[PDB]
């Protein structure tokens, strides 16, 4: 039977999955920035060694 | 050139049904890996068809437009 509880459960499930995806994207972006910064500084050190 | 392939004499009659059937299969939403493989197959059999029969399929695609 179609009842408000089922609608609420469906909506909550959708919202959960969307929020999970957004959180994973944010974490991936932050990791990418950290990697880029480390990569830049090590390249600078290699330039200094030369 | 397949053993079970349609004979040339009967190719005229059967082929319109075959072409229109593949048209319906081509309209499946190519949405899951099995379904996507289905859409690839229906387009891959076109070269087997003679060019006049390849042409009519394109006409069928453009009829709705």
């Amino acid at each position: 039977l179609v009842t408000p509880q089922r609608l609420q459960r469906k909506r909550h499930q959708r919202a959960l999955k969307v929020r999970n995806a957004q959180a994973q994207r944010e974490a991936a972006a932050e990791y990418a920035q950290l990697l880029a910064k480390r990569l830049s500084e090590r390249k600078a050190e290699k330039a200094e060694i030369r | 050139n397949g053993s079970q392939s349609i004979k040339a004499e009967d190719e005229k009659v059967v082929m319109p049904y075959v072409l229109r059937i593949f048209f319906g299969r081509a309209q499946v939403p190519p949405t899951s890996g099995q379904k996507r493989s289905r859409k690839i197959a229906v387009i891959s059999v076109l070269p087997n068809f003679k060019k006049p029969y390849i042409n009519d399929f394109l006409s069928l695609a453009s009829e709705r437009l």
């Binding site: - | 050139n1 397949g2 891959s44």
Partner: protein
């Protein structure tokens, strides 16, 4: 009936071992599935754990990969021509890994016609001209293309995965197997 236990064998010194314990389920074996060309029959097998295995009792189509151009197409299987382990499989047309088989040549021929515009829109002409340098292929493969049946080797295990995928013989592979043929 079939078991893979090693106790029933003689020892390296040749001693006849005594019977330690009754057979355990975790050294079982199952009857061979002699795959053969024909209309598809596959039946699932419940194996150890929740995993499942596919048994190809019959199969007549397989995904074969032309390695030189890095392409792969589905193709009907014509028949088994040579098998290294035993010739009785060749006689009975049983499909197993490493069996040399003949496959239809049409889909590959269509793909090569379209991709290079050679035989064995401006955009099409541009693409064909750009790829024209790579058009040449081995003579042995082209002769088979003329015949319409290509020699291939099965790289899948039909009795396990339920597939008969493979690849087209080339170069020294093709020369050696032609000599054996």
């Amino acid at each position: 009936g079939i078991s893979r236990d090693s106790r029933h064998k003689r020892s390296a010194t040749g001693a006849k071992r005594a019977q330690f314990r009754k057979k355990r389920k975790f050294e079982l074996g199952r009857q061979p599935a002699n795959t053969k060309i024909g209309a598809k029959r596959i039946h699932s097998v419940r194996t150890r754990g929740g995993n499942k295995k596919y048994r190809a009792l019959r199969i007549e189509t397989g995904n074969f990969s032309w390695a030189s151009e890095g392409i792969s197409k589905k193709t009907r299987i014509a028949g088994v021509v040579y098998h290294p382990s035993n010739n009785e499989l060749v006689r009975t047309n049983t499909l197993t890994k490493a069996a040399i088989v003949q496959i239809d040549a049409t889909p590959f021929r269509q793909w090569f016609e379209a991709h290079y515009g050679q035989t064995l829109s401006k955009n099409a002409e541009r693409k064909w001209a750009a790829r024209a340098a790579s058009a040449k292929i081995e003579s042995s493969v082209e002769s088979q293309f003329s015949a319409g049946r290509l020699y291939a080797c099965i790289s899948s295990r039909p009795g396990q995965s339920g597939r008969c995928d493979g690849y087209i013989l080339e170069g020294e592979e093709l020369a050696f197997y032609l000599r054996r043929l």
